[PDB]
Amino acid sequence: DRINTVRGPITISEAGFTLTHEHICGSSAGFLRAWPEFFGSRAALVEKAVRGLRRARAAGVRTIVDVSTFDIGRDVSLLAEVSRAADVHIVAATGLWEDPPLSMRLRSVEELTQFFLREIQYGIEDTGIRAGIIKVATNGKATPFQELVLRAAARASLATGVPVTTHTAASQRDGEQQAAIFESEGLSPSRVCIGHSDDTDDLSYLTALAARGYLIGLDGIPHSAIGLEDNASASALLGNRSWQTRALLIKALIDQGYMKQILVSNDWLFGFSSYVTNIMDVMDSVNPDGMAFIPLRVIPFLREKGVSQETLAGITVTNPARFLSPT
Template structure:
């Protein structure tokens, strides 16, 4: 039976349950926790993350979270493992890179970076036995930069070597997912192993259907949304999800929040703004989005497919 790596070891894909496909335990920056550890309230992040994940897990809803924090987002795999142990949540950790690609990565061939990703998948992350279960890459406003292209090609080669799927960060108003797919196609990646994230930051159905017709998976993974001016609110995002279902793609979409706990030592005003924006945390989708989808005509079977069945198929490669 196919398995996927979690921070507590491999799990059968049939045992993933309800999956939130794009979340974070906590984010900061590369090297910060090593160089200025006093800047990060690690205990506070752990306690608040355990409480937030325990709440959604205790509701009998979510069983697995994909944490797509890469090392340059301050990934702390030991902290993620502690949160998993404390909450009962299965957590899949990521290798890869985010938007601000480390400067030396832009000066080397993709194969040199791919080797690093493969090591984190096959051997472990930062000297631990924790193995990555997904490869994260990122491109944003204005499209793919030259260093981001190197990283994207490295991710493609690591995916082909290991079979582990790719999850991307995009800016959908600039149709960045199309650029990512083009490069991944050039690298010969099976698009059934590709998840184009943040695809609900606008309502361009031509763009979204074009991606789905290429054979990728779509992450509708920014909820509640509406914080960035000009982007849809949560109800508009849910209407887009329903339109994609009506178009025959119930079996190719994911829902998630892109949430991380707002606990930190500094920036209290920003942290409070984030807390007010989503006081429900990882529970927002179960409490609001799924009932809204049902009100729009989605069946129980549709909800089960999106929240449980799709992740099982995505990670199993079926």
């Protein structure tokens, strides 16, 4: 009956309009602490995040799910500060992404389960802030360690009811192996969002996942390097498909009967140290609306394409609440 946020438990009705895959800062463990000048300063990063979340709140957003893990450099004290100043709920994540250090990569499935359970059930570091989601990742066929991470995420979710959300290389159909591993541990697909699924146009892949009961994360809608001229690093990161092409996948899944299984987000950030220098400036030039892009641009676009206000409210309010509520 309660979702954990960086400011404590909230009721399901308090979540409201929820972006289910976002980041305050995409970094690495300990990096903001050791090298804040990379972001100008910690205070500058806080100010940029607060301004952005305030603009998102003005556009209707009430909650974001920050799916930054330990190895994305999640700083829940930073999240708590930004959430208080902007009056936007923030759900924090446990799990591991694609850059775990040796001290994680050498661990067993049982050890990883203990760590994920620590952050869900006890707290993150010494903050008492508890994670409300488990984030995992593959980029193609799972490494042996990533198989353990997926299994540990399933075990932590089975013990707590907290959902799992994934990073995929969608064009490699990673979600199929992720699903197989999750189901081998007994995890219900209704507890799992297969993310970055808007990175592919393969409807046979997307509907294969949705038919089994998975939630489908169409979470990078504004990610596009169309127009960026001669920027190889931005094109490799953002792709050459338009935001409209990504957004139309929302309509496609609605038209196939999966409106209750769609989760939509921007996968935006306010600082970004785990990629090339100045990528944040490039991304901000692509999408000045930042996290407000979903309510300000995507929802009107889909309404114009014939999607009802009621269905879009179900996707942005009802589905995230059903997903995040521990079950």
